[PDB]
């Protein structure tokens, strides 16, 4: 052990397309690491790049085929499973 870490969060992103639903895209980002030490969750959607970033570790880019806004973006973090559900 010299430069190995376990406190590093390992997220896993899953993407799913929906047609005719309240959401057109479902994105699943769960935290699955040996340990990981998440602090806060401050996601934000930048219209400039049309990307919804979760934290300064990973960002979720939206396809330009979809019109997405802060009012359409549904972000819910379940602590029970340490999973972050994104519905757009």
């Amino acid at each position: 052990p010299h430069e190995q870490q376990e406190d590093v969060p390992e997220y896993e992103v899953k993407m799913k397309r929906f047609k005719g639903a309240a959401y057109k895209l479902r994105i699943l980002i769960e935290n699955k690491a040996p340990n990981s030490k998440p602090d806060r969750f401050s996601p934000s959607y930048n219209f400039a790049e049309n990307i919804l970033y979760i934290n300064g570790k990973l960002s979720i880019p939206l396809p330009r085929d979809i019109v997405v806004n802060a009012a359409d973006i549904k972000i819910f973090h379940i602590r029970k499973e340490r999973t972050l559900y994104i519905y757009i």
């Binding site: 639903a21 401050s42 400039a48 819910f76 029970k80």
Partner: peptide
Amino acid sequence: GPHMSVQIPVVEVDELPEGYDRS
């Protein structure tokens, strides 16, 4: 350019409300 970015409020729930698709 269109330098507009908005923060999205995240709700920390134990699961999504009815109507959502959870797996």
